[PDB]
């Protein structure tokens, strides 16, 4: 599936890092869109899609349907600039750039000269490749699989799982999870090329466990390091405890969560108090790609999420940690600038 906007069955606002996604439209100026573009909106100009900063694109026009003449376009993640192209009838689209590093392992005949730096079979070690991945990143490769079982399994009895394993064209791609909990996780992709068998093993880097959050846990030996700690086992029964993180930057590569030894109210981090004012987080932040992760250190309770990118509104939300009659408030304040 992918993005869609319908004008047969208002404003179609869209902006994101597009990983070979298909933007769907249903039916328009300037001229024929997806090859003509409303770049300078005020000067009302018509820049073609050829003279733009995107590396690889695919524009599609479908008339086979007997009810609508739909227009679609596929956007490769390869984009060295932040391109902004408009088209109304209003449908404005600004393609954002992927902030993460891209590791392309081209093991195919097609000379992929679009991205200069690339990795191939010489980097293998006895038909073995050990790739390290940072907190959030993207690994690409171009070959043909044996029985097409790749990049989901793991042999350390601990499967390395991703936010999205996208299989378009002949390119296998792995989207690194912003925070994976386990110490050892791996994934094997056994691909064949030139009658040789290549195994690509992926593992995460030593994750900087810098969780911009609060640790109310009564334990020292934690696999997770929060920027703020405390014990909740000591306070008054009627003492409200306030841990209020404030973040103010243009871009965001932050991990926000908490380790509560008691129960967590509401079901964070999906639900949060505004400040019974249970709102949904994704709508409150208004960002599509927000990853969610959870963990349990025995009886400790870890709940966190990962914000990556700009933020449209100065959002504030509050979660609660409750151990017996005692309480502990936490206020995240993500600024917009």
């Amino acid at each position: 599936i992918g993005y869609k906007c319908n004008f047969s069955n208002i404003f179609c606002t869209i902006h994101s890092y597009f990983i070979y996604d298909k933007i769907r439209l249903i039916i328009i100026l300037p001229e024929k869109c997806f090859q003509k573009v409303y770049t300078d909106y005020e000067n009302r100009v018509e820049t073609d899609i050829s003279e733009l900063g995107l590396i690889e694109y695919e524009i599609e026009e479908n008339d086979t349907n007997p009810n609508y003449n739909e227009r679609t376009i596929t956007i490769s993640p390869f984009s060295p600039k932040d391109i902004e192209f408009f088209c109304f009838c209003m449908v404005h689209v600004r393609v954002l750039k992927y902030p993460h590093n891209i590791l392309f392992t081209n093991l195919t005949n097609d000379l992929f000269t679009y991205l200069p730096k690339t990795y191939n079979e010489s980097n293998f070690v006895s038909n073995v490749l050990e790739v390290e991945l940072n907190d959030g990143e993207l690994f690409v490769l171009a070959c043909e699989l044996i029985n097409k079982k790749c990049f989901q399994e793991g042999k350390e009895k601990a499967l390395y799982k991703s936010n999205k394993i996208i299989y378009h064209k002949n390119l296998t791609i792995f989207k690194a999870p912003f925070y994976v909990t386990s110490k050892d996780v791996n994934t094997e992709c056994t691909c064949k090329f030139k009658n040789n068998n290549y195994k690509i093993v992926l593992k995460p880097k030593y994750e900087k466990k810098v969780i911009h959050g609060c640790n109310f846990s009564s334990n020292v030996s934690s696999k997770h390091t929060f920027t703020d700690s405390l014990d909740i086992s000591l306070v008054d029964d009627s003492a409200h405890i306030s841990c209020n993180v404030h973040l103010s930057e243009p871009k965001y590569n932050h991990l926000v969560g908490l380790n509560c030894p008691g129960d967590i109210i509401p079901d964070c981090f999906f639900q949060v108090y505004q400040p019974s004012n249970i709102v949904y987080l994704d709508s409150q932040i208004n960002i599509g790609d927000i990853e969610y992760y959870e963990d349990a250190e025995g009886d400790d309770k870890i709940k966190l999420f990962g914000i990556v990118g700009s933020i449209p509104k100065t959002t504030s939300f509050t979660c609660i940690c409750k151990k017996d009659k005692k309480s502990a408030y936490m206020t995240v304040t993500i600024d917009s600038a």
Partner: antibody, heavy 123, light 114 residues
């Protein structure tokens, strides 16, 4: 200048344990992977172990498998090596060498070698 | 494993000549596509740590004397000193890095005729 200063030389009874450090200085430590090699008193060189750029991968030979433990602290820019269940043959001069990363490969030559800190195993 | 047969174990030469370090591997060290060899020569000065000379069995390191011109492909590899000096009388080591584990050579001491 590149500078790999090792540390941690002393005598151990057969069966003991020891940790040897290697304070790397003067380069992007997390950019290049590390490794250890030992030179027997007979001046014979052996490959001890090698560690990944961010410590996700490690390799050991069949001789010291499970007995030694390589590790790196990219916060302080220092390499380590924890040896256990030591034998008399483990007496050698242990070198801390940085692998070449021009061409991105896990197995490469050692661009720069360290001073070397020797250990001994005797009762 | 790989065995690195390196001869001779002892060697005595005069000042200002050419000497041919010889080393042969048990298995080949030549990728088909890469078209390069995975052999490295090191200089272990007496009372000192070793240091790299030539990588890829031909390309030399920065700061390595141009007289050191290694050679060979596949199994046999030979290093040559165009003009021997009185500063590099060190045991040269022949190390492979073609597959795990990486093994070194026996060493070729450079005793000199004085």
């Amino acid at each position: 200048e590149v500078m790999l200063v090792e540390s941690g030389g002393d005598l151990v009874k057969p069966g003991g344990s020891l940790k040897v450090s290697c304070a790397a200085s003067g380069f992007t430590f997390s950019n290049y992977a590390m490794s250890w090699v030992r030179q027997t008193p007979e001046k014979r060189l052996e490959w001890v172990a090698t560690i990944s750029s961010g410590a996700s991968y490690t390799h050991y030979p069949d001789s010291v498998k499970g007995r030694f433990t390589i590790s790196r602290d990219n916060a302080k820019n220092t390499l380590y090596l924890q040896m256990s269940s030591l034998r008399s043959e483990d007496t050698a001069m242990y070198y801390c060498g940085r692998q070449v990363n021009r061409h991105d490969r896990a197995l490469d030559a050692m661009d720069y070698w360290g001073q070397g800190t020797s250990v001994t195993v005797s009762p | 494993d790989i065995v690195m047969s390196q001869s001779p174990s002892s060697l005595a030469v005069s000042v200002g000549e050419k000497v041919t370090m010889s080393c042969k591997s048990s298995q080949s060290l030549f990728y088909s596509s890469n078209q390069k060899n995975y052999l490295a020569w090191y200089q272990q000065k007496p009372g000192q740590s070793p240091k790299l000379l030539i990588y890829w069995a031909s390309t030399r390191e920065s700061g390595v004397p141009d007289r050191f011109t290694g050679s060979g492909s596949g199994t046999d590899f030979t290093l040559t000193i165009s003009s021997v000096k009185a500063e590099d009388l060190a045991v040269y080591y022949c190390q492979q890095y073609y597959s795990y584990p990486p093994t070194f050579g026996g060493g070729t001491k450079l005793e000199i005729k004085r």
